[PDB]
Design a protein around this ligand. Sequence first.
Ligand SMILES: *[C@@H]1O[C@H](CO)[C@@H](O[C@@H]2O[C@H](CO)[C@@H](O[C@@H]3O[C@H](CO[C@H]4O[C@H](CO)[C@@H](O)[C@H](O)[C@@H]4O)[C@@H](O)[C@H](O[C@H]4O[C@H](CO)[C@@H](O)[C@H](O)[C@@H]4O)[C@@H]3O)[C@H](O)[C@H]2NC(C)=O)[C@H](O)[C@H]1NC(C)=O
Ligand SMILES: *[C@@H]1O[C@H](CO)[C@@H](O[C@@H]2O[C@H](CO)[C@@H](O[C@@H]3O[C@H](CO)[C@@H](O)[C@H](O[C@H]4O[C@H](CO)[C@@H](O)[C@H](O)[C@@H]4O)[C@@H]3O)[C@H](O)[C@H]2NC(C)=O)[C@H](O)[C@H]1NC(C)=O
Ligand code: NAG
Ligand code: NAG
Ligand code: CO
Ligand code: CO
Lengths: 538, 538
Amino acid sequence: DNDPLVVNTDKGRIRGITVDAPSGKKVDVWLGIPYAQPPVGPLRFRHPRPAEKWTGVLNTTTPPNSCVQIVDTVFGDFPGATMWNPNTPLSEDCLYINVVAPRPRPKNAAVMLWIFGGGFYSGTATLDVYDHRALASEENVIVVSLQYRVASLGFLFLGTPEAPGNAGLFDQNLALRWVRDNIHRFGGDPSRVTLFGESAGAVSVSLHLLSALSRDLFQRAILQSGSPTAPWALVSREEATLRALRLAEAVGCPHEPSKLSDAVECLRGKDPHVLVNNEWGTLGICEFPFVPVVDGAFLDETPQRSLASGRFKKTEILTGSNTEEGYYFIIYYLTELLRKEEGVTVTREEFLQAVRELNPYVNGAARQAIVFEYTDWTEPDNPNSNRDALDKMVGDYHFTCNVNEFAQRYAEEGNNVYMYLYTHRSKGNPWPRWTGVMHGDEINYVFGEPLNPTLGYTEDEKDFSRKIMRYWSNFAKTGNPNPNTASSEFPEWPKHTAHGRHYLELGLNTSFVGRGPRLRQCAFWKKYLPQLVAATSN
Amino acid sequence: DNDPLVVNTDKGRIRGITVDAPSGKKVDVWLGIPYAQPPVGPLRFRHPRPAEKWTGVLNTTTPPNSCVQIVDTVFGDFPGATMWNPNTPLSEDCLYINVVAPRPRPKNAAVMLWIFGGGFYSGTATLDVYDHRALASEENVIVVSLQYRVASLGFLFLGTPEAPGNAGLFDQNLALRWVRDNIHRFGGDPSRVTLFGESAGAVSVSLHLLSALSRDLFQRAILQSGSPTAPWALVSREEATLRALRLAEAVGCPHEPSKLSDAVECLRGKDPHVLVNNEWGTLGICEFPFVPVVDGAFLDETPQRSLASGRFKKTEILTGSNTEEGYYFIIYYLTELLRKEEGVTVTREEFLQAVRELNPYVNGAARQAIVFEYTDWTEPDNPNSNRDALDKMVGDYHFTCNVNEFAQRYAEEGNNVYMYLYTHRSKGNPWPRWTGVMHGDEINYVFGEPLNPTLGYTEDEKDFSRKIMRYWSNFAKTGNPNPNTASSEFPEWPKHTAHGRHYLELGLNTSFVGRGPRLRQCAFWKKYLPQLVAATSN
Ligand SMILES: *[C@@H]1O[C@H](CO)[C@@H](O[C@@H]2O[C@H](CO)[C@@H](O[C@@H]3O[C@H](CO[C@H]4O[C@H](CO)[C@@H](O)[C@H](O)[C@@H]4O)[C@@H](O)[C@H](O[C@H]4O[C@H](CO)[C@@H](O)[C@H](O)[C@@H]4O)[C@@H]3O)[C@H](O)[C@H]2NC(C)=O)[C@H](O)[C@H]1NC(C)=O
Ligand SMILES: *[C@@H]1O[C@H](CO)[C@@H](O[C@@H]2O[C@H](CO)[C@@H](O[C@@H]3O[C@H](CO)[C@@H](O)[C@H](O[C@H]4O[C@H](CO)[C@@H](O)[C@H](O)[C@@H]4O)[C@@H]3O)[C@H](O)[C@H]2NC(C)=O)[C@H](O)[C@H]1NC(C)=O
Ligand SMILES: *[C@@H]1O[C@H](CO)[C@@H](O)[C@H](O)[C@H]1NC(C)=O
Ligand SMILES: *[C@@H]1O[C@H](CO)[C@@H](O)[C@H](O)[C@H]1NC(C)=O
Ligand SMILES: [Co+2]
Ligand SMILES: [Co+2]
């Protein structure tokens, strides 16, 4: 056939459609290419199974279903909240891929594969924030996004072959194999596959760097605000089984560590929505109920021991954090203090109580070490300082420091690393101005949302998006974000070396290069506090 | 008399002499005016008895004896060591005063009274670095210095009335009463008497702001690198007794707690040089064998309880610290590592051993807090960082942070405080380069030594001398170091507020104003570390 919009995948034929990007430029899109058998009925919790081949031609012109998940109604129809809520119908049948190619269709181009992050409980590839149209048309790259099972439906673990765990990761893995097989027909290059994700999506990307089954399915990796060594990224096999039995109990099912086949069978019987809506029990800040676990097949050792032994892919890494990683999660947790309102502050007394609520597992001597490390000593009682203190102690421990650790290990094992610190507030930020540059703020800019003129981004912000969009893309191409010509509009990004530890600051009016970021506090969490908790355990 | 150089004191008549400052400017000087009975034999260790009235006229024209003390023979004839060594004959007969008045002799000008510091074991007002002429001639102020008993001869304590302790402080006090009684005859204003000292001398100055006795004798105070809250500035009456009995044993006499009167008797019969040369034994860094003690008369409470309540003179204060306070004391103690030579460095392993030796009293969980607080987490194993970390951990604990505490307690008691940070290296510094700005470097500049045409100070340093001489002088005049006209060559020195905590950096090409200085580390010692030691103790 001579129609370019149709493509012959290894399992059948699909038809795409030509759509114009908000930039005016046009791209070809294929939306909702099935990569697996719908994981319904007896297949729930279990690993994905390759899609059955189909007769005739399939219309891949519609954004696919998103996986069954919780919806965020906490702040109602607040744009800053609803933008992360699913914009397609919720279904168990959600395992699909989206492919976007620039026009004219490139001969053989690098492919950027987006694994979304939703803390392993939420998310969809169809979110308007992740728009491939802009990234593809502007950087001349194949942009690909996959859907993966999320929450317990994707991460329930019991130890039995009935609930093996990491089902969502296997969903991603199968989708990666699909890309190697089929991406060339779109103008892709199965050799040059760059994985990029944010938060839990970046955690995923990192696990694919570690995984045996995922090793030779991609080339490079970009990791936004995520790391496999993060406290929330994994959960012990023992806890994961208890979390599952708690879900069984809360939903009405039998809960007995003796007979687990009864639990899974009953759980496969209950409603998907009824299932996901009961996962949330007594959890502290930044801990999610159903996440990856060391299963033996996808991962046979904790990311700690994989990093320590150097057992991870040898390839280039682009990673980094935002300035206020903590605030987002403190806003949803800990809700009476830090309300969604302008000019929020924290009294010294309130701050003292907060470090107890935000680190519920430490002994007090460790708490006092936390209060000392995170208080501003020029002005200890300052209400602004004490609020920002809460952001940093959450943001460092759960995000910034883990990204640093992963970036360092990769560097000292001989790999080229490119670290960033994202310091940019959008003018049109819907959140209170004390929140600053929060978790996931960079996403709008990497996907080239400022280029959409219907959203009144400033002209400087439009240049800024194009700037980091370039860094990202030509890292995916060359393994180095810096252009070949070394331009003025694209400042130099030094390699994050094992000794130097340099990062580029990504902001409007800067080319600043620091060392870190936040090396002292990251040493506090990784070095000092562990040995203090070890000494004061009795 | 019609001879201006002759002065009628309340105990007799004295003849001075007119000489030139090194600058050329001429001043009248009175050297070795006796303010007390020579504390010899029976009067040893005891308080000073006032001067006995003398017949005729006494030629106070020769620099007085220095009190009996040890001489620094550690580095030989090295100028950096010998400048602090006594330059007049050593005698127990040493209780004298020096008065220097400018010409033309002014009608009630300000009075700047210098109390030297030598860790209460050494020092003399006769040192070439304490030359008054330049200060009097260049600032039009009456400059007064006093000799006080140092070491055991001035600070031996046994609880007995024959060894009541603080003898050296009562020496200082009696001399202050002399100045109040007589300074008008020399052309000074008795109400405008300003005390200023360095190290132990500054500690002394602070103890006069606290003391019941010295309370009303002076107006203002200047405190250079010293405060009464410093760890080395006092001892438990209980220790002091043991130190005394340890000396009594070492010198070869009865060391019996049963009767102390038998010990004091012998000590009064022993050679003074023999006494001062046997005081040193088992002592860590920055702790001196015979220092002030809470006696009931001069001080009835620890400077801690005194500062806590608010019982201290309500006056202006000009205080501060140098950048590298610790080095000097680490050069002498801990002498195998950190030799007196260029480009010395400390390995991480050596640094780990040093923190053990320099803080010999802490438990080990505290040492882990110290190694963490004093390490460059940018580059932890840096040999330069590990050497400078040694300076800072000594300099903060024994000096900078105690100055900070004192100044802050005065600020929040509603007094005008002016904090400095001296950051200047003289071009002709005899010590190695790595030492930087050490303890007592400011002295040369406050006393106007650069103005001496025979010495190799640069023209900028000569300006910098006059600048800090001005700040010092018109503080002693007005109560504020800033010029009334608010000039541009003499930058503004903001007030050290209990809230702002601003300090002025005293350096060559800087007018910079910071906060603290070094509040983060000062809070480590004053807030965090004691509560850690409390938690980890059993
Ligand atoms: C600090 O304190 C000292 C004493 O502790 C004060 O006394 C000064 O001392 C000297 C010497 O004693 C005075 O100078 C002269 O005194 C002489 C006394 O005569 C004896 O000594 C000299 C030898 O040194 C010989 O003449 C003789 O052998 C005596 O044994 C006199 O010589 C002088 O007086 C003369 O005056 C006229 C001129 O007017 C001459 O023509 C005569 O020769 C006559 O004898 C002279 O006075 C000195 O003057 C004393 N000072 C004062 C102010 O009187 C010092 O006062 C004090 N220091 C200072 C700098 O003032
Ligand atoms: C996707 O799936 C759909 C359904 O599963 C299917 O659509 C088909 O596409 C063809 C070709 O594009 C269409 O052809 C039409 O055939 C009818 C015959 O009755 C004609 O009447 C149509 O002509 C219309 O053209 C104008 C439309 O603007 C109008 O003026 C007026 O309605 C005319 O009648 C037209 O030629 C048809 O819609 C279907 N047919 C079949 C048999 O499925 C196709 O598989 C996929 N479509 C695409 C384009 O991806
Ligand atoms: C920062 O950017 C602004 C433009 O908004 C401009 O003042 C200048 O380029 C930068 N600041 C400096 C260098 O003063
Ligand atoms: C002071 O230092 C600055 C460095 O920024 C420079 O202007 C110069 O070296 C110095 N200024 C003067 C007045 O010499
Ligand atoms: Co039950
Ligand atoms: Co004995």
